[PDB]
Write a protein that binds this ligand. Structure first.
Ligand SMILES: *[C@@H]1O[C@H](CO)[C@@H](O[C@@H]2O[C@H](CO)[C@@H](O)[C@H](O)[C@H]2NC(C)=O)[C@H](O)[C@H]1NC(C)=O
Ligand SMILES: *[C@@H]1O[C@H](CO)[C@@H](O[C@@H]2O[C@H](CO)[C@@H](O)[C@H](O)[C@H]2NC(C)=O)[C@H](O)[C@H]1NC(C)=O
Ligand SMILES: *[C@@H]1O[C@H](CO)[C@@H](O[C@@H]2O[C@H](CO)[C@@H](O)[C@H](O)[C@H]2NC(C)=O)[C@H](O)[C@H]1NC(C)=O
Ligand SMILES: *[C@@H]1O[C@H](CO)[C@@H](O[C@@H]2O[C@H](CO)[C@@H](O)[C@H](O)[C@H]2NC(C)=O)[C@H](O)[C@H]1NC(C)=O
Ligand SMILES: *[C@@H]1O[C@H](CO)[C@@H](O[C@@H]2O[C@H](CO)[C@@H](O)[C@H](O)[C@H]2NC(C)=O)[C@H](O)[C@H]1NC(C)=O
Ligand SMILES: *[C@@H]1O[C@H](CO)[C@@H](O[C@@H]2O[C@H](CO)[C@@H](O)[C@H](O)[C@H]2NC(C)=O)[C@H](O)[C@H]1NC(C)=O
Ligand SMILES: *[C@@H]1O[C@H](CO)[C@@H](O[C@@H]2O[C@H](CO)[C@@H](O)[C@H](O)[C@H]2NC(C)=O)[C@H](O)[C@H]1NC(C)=O
Ligand SMILES: *[C@@H]1O[C@H](CO)[C@@H](O)[C@H](O)[C@H]1NC(C)=O
Ligand SMILES: *[C@@H]1O[C@H](CO)[C@@H](O)[C@H](O)[C@H]1NC(C)=O
Ligand SMILES: *[C@@H]1O[C@H](CO)[C@@H](O)[C@H](O)[C@H]1NC(C)=O
Ligand SMILES: *[C@@H]1O[C@H](CO)[C@@H](O)[C@H](O)[C@H]1NC(C)=O
Ligand SMILES: *[C@@H]1O[C@H](CO)[C@@H](O)[C@H](O)[C@H]1NC(C)=O
Ligand SMILES: *[C@@H]1O[C@H](CO)[C@@H](O)[C@H](O)[C@H]1NC(C)=O
Lengths: 98, 370, 36, 236, 85, 49, 49, 34, 50
């Protein structure tokens, strides 16, 4: 009958989905260039400025990717701590009396 | 695997090496039916050009524009484009092109540039900082210069403030430089803002009348109507192909869509600027675009210390299409389809037991043959 | 609150923490470990 | 055929509530079952809208016009600065056949009407640029949005069967784009046109402001719900 | 980059960041698999409950597996899988 | 930016860094409150000596 | 002015990100310590160990 | 007026009991009016 | 020529005769001397918050 008793698992799922969503959405930013699409910015300019534009896009997207990876590392460490606790509980309170 | 692992020996395990992607074949170009010569001669070969303070403006639309016929001619002293490379002008489609024509002195051609300051740049003609288009300047001493003096050309010299971009001022009112208000009567510190030119054939460079025309474009604001001279071609379906729909270039497979575009709809996207639908300019058919298959590839080896046979797993890819060439593992070698992807080079058995190198979804492989 | 940064107060004040500690101490003094 | 009226009928300038009317598709792209946030010129929710039951009104940035009309007495519109041959003016009329759109320096008079028995007030139509003809625009609630941006005149329209007695109904109905005109003018004021019989009309006027909105697109790509962003805190 | 030779050529002069990113993600995934494996695989054999069940009056019907469903799960597990989305 | 419109306009094109920064800080604060509450609130009644 | 503002913006953004990451690490460590403290409260105050 | 700032739209009461929405500094709010 | 925004108050800090203004940490000009009246004032920002 009662819902919202599993807040932890739902919270984990929501956090992962939100992080992936914002990572994907960051792909539409401008980062100071004249556009946000490679094909149009390539099919319109003499390369000597194309390198400038691609450099701007590249550095922006690289920062976004690095931020995502670091956040993932932190969450993974926390999950590992939780699962170590779960394994200890399973070993102690299920296979014996504590 | 040895190359990517930086060693001459590999131990038992599974290693992810690289990625594969289906190579696109042929190309598709789709431009609208409409075709007619674009009237560039009238604006370029015009007998009379308006003054700088009253620059002539024209709007060009619904035409087929060729720019090579303008690049080849050397009659223009200066041909400088800003947002686009000139040689590519024949491969893009725009709409609502703007052409402006006027005449200035020889040394003032530098003032026609975004982010510029001077006399014309702020009091006669102002360009936006992010202006995209091109500017054309050529010599007109042999026609626009007269021995008796040229006075049909006047420029605005005095104004209350600077001009906005693409602003035209035609008001001729006495300018009060001093504190005393002229009250509509010329007097001390009162001057006429419009000054005539002194164009004479005796004058050398820097004073001859030069004719300047500027072209301004738009970038993806509406269904384009000013296309370049490119020949269209037919279209194909269910094949990873390069497509160019009215200037929108991309790669993928095309399918007969079922989403109902409203009559004012042109294309569609769902999340984060992913154009997944389109309407072809000619047939007016709604289609959807999806990228052709791609994914990672990994290997399974029992360690080079033991043997040299390997197995190859393509991750999350249907077994129907697979042939990095590696056609050797595409002819008659044993093939298997698992929830993780497709496995090539391994023999599937019905015996289940505790296993070596894992694969995924409860499937794992080991060396007895693999 | 100097240059766009702020410090927020904690939910539980010191009096509440002191009350919790006093309750725990009185419980363990009087009831042994049964109250837990 | 220029003449001035002597009855001097006075349309009562009442005020009524905007509720949740005046929402249009902002762009030509297609979306389905998604929430999109956009910043643009709209009509703020629950705002005063002026009701007339023909003064010259300011145009401002944009205009929302509505009419619970019976038998299409309202015909056309006039736009401009001084509404004389001195300055460029815009005229839109919609007779029984195709509509007429002209951009010329006409000489309007103070009491324009269709002269029921295209010679209402203009008599000195000088040299001009733009003319256009297309399909007719028209217990019927007819809503229009007029905008003038970037040398472009954008007109959105919607027609609904209205069964309410007096004022605007509660509900939601998006406005599909109707037409765009590539003309650059300095419109500041405007006035309506009535085909008064010759052998007392109700409409609502509101002004647009820039703000942010949240729109919901259903599975079919039709806007079905919206939320204002600059309102009571819950909306924000 | 997304299928652009020029973009890849410009990017390859930035070093070897991508190798590190891929290594980190792979480590995370392997850690997850090992993590669940060590949490759940605490036994060595697969014991089976006897067909006849008289546990002194205690009733374990709602937590024992149900052979009727193809999932071979119990009542409570099925209730759990329907409330996390 | 320090309350400058030009700085705000230029920053607008960098994406949505600020949302996730504030999200992380709020998560930290909530975690602090939960830590204190979980450590100290071990009893259901307030006993008296 | 846009160039100068871009330089200032990128520098300050990098500094902010560094600060946030350090805060995250320290918060994780403090949370571990708080969990240990809660366990000690439960096991040694409410009973004999 | 609370140590966390200023609150508008809430009726302050002198009764006290366990709450659900925290505010800060020992003050918290709930919905009966708010 | 020094521009800023905030609230002004009669500062009680004693400036040396050659002093012009003051700051405490990280370039925070919290004092000023007006060119005309030669009066010492302290500046603090007007209120803000979430
Ligand atoms: C303006 O008129 C000149 C006439 O000399 C055009 O120049 C010639 O155009 C024809 C068109 O077919 C070409 O075949 C010639 O090669 C051009 N050059 C000469 C020296 O005759 C010019 O093209 C006209 N301007 C525009 C915009 O069309
Ligand atoms: C690999 O592709 C084939 C064909 O593209 C898939 O077979 C299709 O399966 C769907 C769903 O059952 C059917 O509606 C189609 O009619 C099938 N097509 C054919 C030609 O048989 C197959 O399912 C794909 N592999 C996997 C694992 O899904
Ligand atoms: C649009 O027209 C209005 C008036 O119809 C112009 O406003 C006038 O501007 C001049 C010059 O600044 C003033 O002397 C008048 O007093 C103004 N009149 C009114 C009624 O405001 C306005 O400048 C025009 N906008 C353009 C041409 O872009
Ligand atoms: C009604 O508006 C139309 C606009 O199309 C006016 O112009 C006539 O349009 C019809 C199209 O049905 C043409 O056949 C006529 O040649 C157009 N001119 C005239 C003089 O009729 C039309 O004048 C307006 N009035 C009427 C009574 O139709
Ligand atoms: C056609 O348009 C031109 C463009 O301005 C008009 O030319 C001037 O119009 C003003 C209007 O008051 C007159 O004062 C000038 O004397 C006109 N100059 C010339 C050279 O004609 C012209 O009036 C327009 N034609 C008509 C019939 O209105
Ligand atoms: C969206 O489009 C679908 C498909 O046109 C609409 O579903 C149809 O609705 C009509 C009206 O009730 C029915 O007669 C058809 O049988 C329906 N077709 C189906 C269900 O395939 C639907 O009404 C539209 N609107 C919404 C909100 O879904
Ligand atoms: C253990 O409890 C279950 C209920 O959880 C009992 O199953 C019920 O048995 C009665 C008797 O026929 C049925 O009317 C109910 O519908 C059953 N419940 C369900 C959920 O199927 C079961 O009988 C109990 N064990 C014993 C030995 O009596
Ligand atoms: C474009 O032209 C072709 C052949 O001239 C015709 O078959 C097609 O219908 C046209 N497209 C339209 C009218 O939209
Ligand atoms: C494989 O390794 C084993 C032990 O490391 C060794 O005894 C054996 O010779 C190896 N096989 C080779 C070197 O072919
Ligand atoms: C044994 O395996 C083969 C292929 O690996 C399969 O065709 C066959 O059905 C399996 N045997 C049984 C009894 O399923
Ligand atoms: C509309 O105007 C009336 C008086 O003109 C005013 O009482 C009312 O509050 C206004 N409605 C608003 C501001 O929503
Ligand atoms: C409690 O607070 C209320 C304010 O609602 C006040 O009227 C009252 O005097 C206070 N004291 C008691 C004992 O109710
Ligand atoms: C500055 O000049 C004004 C006007 O003469 C005078 O009132 C004021 O006292 C002068 N300031 C100083 C410091 O002398």
């Amino acid at each position: 009958s009662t819902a919202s008793a599993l807040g932890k698992l739902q919270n984990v799922v929501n956090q992962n989905a939100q992080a992936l969503n914002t990572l994907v959405k960051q792909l539409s930013s401008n980062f100071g260039a004249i556009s946000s699409v490679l094909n149009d910015i390539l099919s319109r300019l003499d390369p000597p400025e194309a390198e400038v534009q691609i450099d701007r896009l590249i550095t922006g997207r690289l920062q976004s990717l690095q931020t995502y990876v670091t956040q993932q590392l932190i969450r993974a460490a926390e999950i590992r701590a939780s699962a170590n606790l779960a394994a200890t509980k399973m070993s102690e309170c299920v296979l014996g009396q504590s | 695997t040895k190359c990517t692992l930086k060693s001459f020996t590999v131990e038992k395990g599974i290693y992810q090496t690289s990625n594969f992607r289906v190579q696109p074949t042929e190309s598709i170009v789709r431009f609208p039916n409409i075709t007619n010569l674009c009237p560039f001669g009238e604006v370029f070969n015009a007998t009379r050009f308006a003054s700088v303070y009253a620059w002539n403006r024209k709007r060009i639309s619904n035409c087929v524009a060729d720019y090579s016929v303008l690049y080849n001619s050397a009659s223009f002293s200066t041909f400088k484009c800003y947002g686009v490379s000139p040689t590519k002008l024949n491969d893009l489609c725009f709409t609502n092109v703007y052409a402006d024509s006027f005449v200035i002195r020889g040394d003032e051609v530098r003032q026609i540039a975004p982010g510029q300051t001077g006399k014309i740049a702020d009091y006669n003609y102002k360009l936006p900082d992010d202006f995209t288009g091109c500017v054309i300047a050529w010599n007109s001493n042999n026609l626009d210069s007269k021995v008796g003096g040229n006075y049909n050309y006047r420029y605005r010299l005095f104004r209350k403030s600077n001009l906005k971009p693409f602003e035209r001022d035609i008001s001729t009112e006495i300018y009060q430089a001093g504190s005393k208000p002229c009250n509509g009567v010329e007097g001390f510190n009162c001057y006429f803002p419009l000054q005539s030119y002194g164009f004479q054939p005796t004058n050398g460079v820097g004073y001859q009348p030069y004719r300047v025309v500027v072209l301004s474009f738009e970038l993806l604001h509406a269904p384009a109507t000013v296309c370049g001279p490119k020949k269209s071609t037919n279209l194909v379906k269910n094949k990873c192909v390069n497509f160019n729909f009215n200037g929108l270039t991309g790669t993928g497979v095309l399918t007969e869509s079922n989403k109902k575009f409203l009559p004012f709809q042109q294309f569609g996207r769902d999340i984060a600027d992913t154009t997944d639908a389109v309407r072809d300019p000619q047939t007016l058919e709604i289609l959807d675009i999806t990228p052709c298959s791609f994914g990672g590839v990994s290997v399974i080896t029992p360690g080079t210390n033991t043997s040299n046979q390997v197995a190859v797993l393509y991750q999350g890819v249907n077994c129907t299409e697979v042939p990095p060439t590696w056609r050797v593992y595409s002819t008659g070698s044993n093939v298997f389809q698992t929830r993780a992807g497709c496995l090539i080079g391994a023999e599937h058995v019905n015996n289940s037991y505790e296993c070596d190198i894992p694969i995924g979804a409860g499937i794992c492989a080991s060396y007895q043959s693999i | 609150k100097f240059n766009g940064l702020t410090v927020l107060p904690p939910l539980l004040t010191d009096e509440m923490i002191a009350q919790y500690t006093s309750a725990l101490l009185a419980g363990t003094i009087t009831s042994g470990w049964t109250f837990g | 055929q220029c003449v001035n009226l002597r009855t001097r009928t006075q349309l009562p300038p009442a005020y009524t509530n905007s509720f949740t009317r005046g929402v249009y598709y902002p762009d030509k792209v297609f979306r389905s079952s998604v929430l999109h946030s956009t910043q643009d010129l709209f009509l703020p929710f629950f705002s005063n809208v002026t009701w007339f039951h023909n003064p010259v009104l300011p145009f401002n940035d944009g205009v929302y016009f509505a009419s619970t009309e019976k038998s299409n007495i309202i015909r056309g519109w006039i736009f401009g600065t001084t509404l004389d041959s001195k300055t460029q003016s815009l005229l839109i009329v919609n007779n029984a056949t195709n509509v007429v759109i002209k951009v010329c320096e006409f000489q309007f008079c103070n009491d324009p009407f269709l002269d029921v028995y295209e010679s209402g007030v203009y008599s000195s139509a000088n040299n001009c640029t733009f003319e256009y003809v297309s399909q007719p625009f028209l217990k019927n609630l007819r809503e229009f949005v007029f905008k003038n941006i970037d040398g472009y005149f954008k007109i959105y329209s919607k027609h609904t069967p209205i069964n309410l007695v007096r004022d605007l109904p509660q509900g939601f109905s998006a406005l599909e784009p109707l037409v765009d005109l590539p003309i650059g003018i300095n419109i500041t004021r405007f006035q309506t046109l009535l085909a008064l019989h010759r052998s007392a009309a109700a409409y609502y006027v509101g002004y647009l402001q820039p703000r942010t909105f949240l729109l919901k697109y259903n599975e079919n790509g039709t806007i079905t719900d919206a939320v204002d962003c600059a309102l009571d805190p819950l909306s924000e | 980059c997304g299928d652009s030779t020029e973009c890849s050529n410009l990017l390859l002069q930035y070093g070897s960041f991508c190798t590190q990113l891929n290594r980190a993600l792979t480590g995370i995934a392997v850690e997850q698999d090992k993590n669940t494996q060590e949490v759940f695989a605490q036994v060595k054999q697969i014991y089976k409950t006897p067909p006849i069940k008289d546990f002194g009056g205690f009733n374990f019907s709602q937590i024992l597996p149900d052979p009727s469903k193809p999932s071979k799960r119990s009542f409570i597990e099925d209730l759990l899988f329907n409330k996390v989305t």
